[PDB]
Design a protein around this ligand. Structure first.
Ligand SMILES: [Cl-]
Length: 342
C-alpha cells in the first residue's frame, strides 16, 4: 500500500517545501526529477516509457502532440478546484489544447529584455529606451552596449518571431523569405555586438554584473534580480516586456499516456489548485501562476510586478507561437546557423 508519484519539471520551478508539504499531507512518496533543457524533456516524452506520472511541457509542444498519443486527457472530476484557474488564461492555452483537455496550466511568462539598470543608463542615458526592443535591436544601441555584454537566447524559434514582430511582420510568418531575408539581415547587423547565444548563462551573468542586456525568460530574470539583491552586490537587474509586444508562453502539467500512479497524480494536481500552494510557488520562483483564486495570496512584490503579472494592455500585445510547416522549421535552423556564424 505504498503510494508513489513521479514528476518531471524544470529546475528552479517549485517552492523548496512544496513536495515536503504534499508528502506530509498525503503520505505519498514523491520522486521529483528536474530538467534544464526542453530538448531533453521532449526527446524522452517522444520515446515513451518515461516512468513519469506528471510532466511539465510547453503548451506549444502539447499542441504538436495532440494526435500522437503522448498524453492522456485529464479527468476533471478528480480536480474539484479546477474552477480556480483563470478562464481568460485557459482560453489562450486552449489555442494549443482545445477545451483544455490535456493540460493544467501551471505558470506562464514572456520572452523579453533582462538588463542591468545602472549599466544601461551609464551607456545610453537615463532615458534609455528600456520599454522597447529598440534597446537591443537597434544596431546603434547595441554597438554602444557591446562592451558591457549582450546575450541572446540560442533559440531561433523565439528570436526569429521576436525580430519578425519588431519588423512589423507576422511573428508567426509562414513565408520563408521573411526569415532568410529581412530577419537575417537585421540579425547579421546586430551579430558583431552579441557576446554569446545561450539558453541560460545570461541568468547568472545578469546577477553578477557580467552582462548588461539579454533576451530572456521573465521569471528567470526576476530570479537573477532577486539573487543579486540577496548577495548585496549592488547589481540592479530589471526586466521589460517591450511596448512592441513579445512572445508569451505557458508551462503546463500533463499526464503521459502510460502513467501508472494516476490517483496520486490527480491528488498532486488538485493540491496545486489550492490557492495558497501555487501562490507560495509564485512567491519563490517569480512567475505568474494560472490560478486566479491564488492571485490575492501572492506576495505584493510579485503580483504587483507588471513584468510578472502584466495588465490587459500588455497582454493584448503578446503573441504565441504557431506550429509551422517542417519546411519553415528547416529554414529557421539553417538561417540560425548563418546568423551565429556572422
Ligand atoms: Cl507554450
Amino acid at each position: 500500500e505504498q503510494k508513489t508519484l513521479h514528476i518531471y519539471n524544470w529546475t528552479e520551478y517549485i517552492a523548496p517545501d512544496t513536495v515536503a508539504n504534499f508528502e506530509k499531507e498525503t503520505g505519498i512518496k514523491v520522486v521529483y526529477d528536474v530538467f534544464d533543457s526542453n530538448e531533453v524533456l521532449e526527446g524522452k516524452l517522444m520515446a515513451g516509457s518515461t516512468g513519469f506520472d506528471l510532466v511539465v511541457p510547453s503548451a506549444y509542444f502539447l499542441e504538436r502532440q495532440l494526435t500522437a498519443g503522448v498524453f492522456q486527457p485529464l479527468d476533471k472530476s478528480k480536480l474539484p478546484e479546477w474552477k480556480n484557474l483563470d478562464p481568460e488564461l485557459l482560453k489562450l492555452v486552449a489555442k494549443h489544447d482545445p477545451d483544455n483537455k490535456f493540460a493544467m496550466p501551471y505558470m506562464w511568462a514572456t520572452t523579453g529584455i533582462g538588463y542591468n539598470v545602472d549599466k544601461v543608463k551609464a551607456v545610453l542615458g537615463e532615458n534609455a529606451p528600456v520599454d522597447s526592443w529598440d534597446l537591443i535591436l537597434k544596431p546603434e544601441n547595441l554597438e554602444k552596449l557591446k562592451s558591457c555584454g549582450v546575450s541572446f537566447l540560442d533559440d531561433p524559434e523565439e528570436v526569429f518571431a521576436t525580430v519578425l514582430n519588431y519588423l512589423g511582420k507576422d511573428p508567426n510568418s509562414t513565408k520563408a523569405d521573411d526569415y532568410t531575408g529581412p530577419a537575417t539581415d537585421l540579425l547579421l547587423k546586430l551579430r558583431p555586438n552579441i557576446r554569446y547565444f545561450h539558453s541560460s548563462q545570461y541568468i547568472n551573468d545578469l546577477a553578477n554584473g557580467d552582462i548588461c542586456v539579454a533576451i530572456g525568460w521573465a521569471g528567470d530574470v526576476w530570479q537573477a534580480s532577486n539573487r543579486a539583491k540577496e548577495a548585496k552586490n549592488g547589481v540592479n537587474v530589471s526586466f521589460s516586456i517591450p511596448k512592441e509586444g513579445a512572445m508569451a508562453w505557458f508551462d503546463v502539467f500533463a499526464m503521459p499516456a502510460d502513467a501508472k500512479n494516476k490517483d496520486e497524480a490527480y491528488q498532486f494536481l488538485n493540491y496545486l489548485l489550492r490557492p495558497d500552494v501555487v501562490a507560495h510557488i509564485s512567491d519563490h520562483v517569480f512567475y505568474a501562476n494560472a490560478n486566479k483564486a491564488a492571485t490575492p495570496l501572492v506576495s505584493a512584490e510579485v503580483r504587483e510586478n507588471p513584468g510578472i503579472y502584466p495588465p490587459a494592455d500588455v497582454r493584448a500585445k503578446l503573441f504565441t507561437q504557431k506550429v509551422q510547416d517542417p519546411k519553415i522549421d528547416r529554414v529557421r535552423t539553417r538561417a540560425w546557423t548563418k546568423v551565429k556564424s556572422g
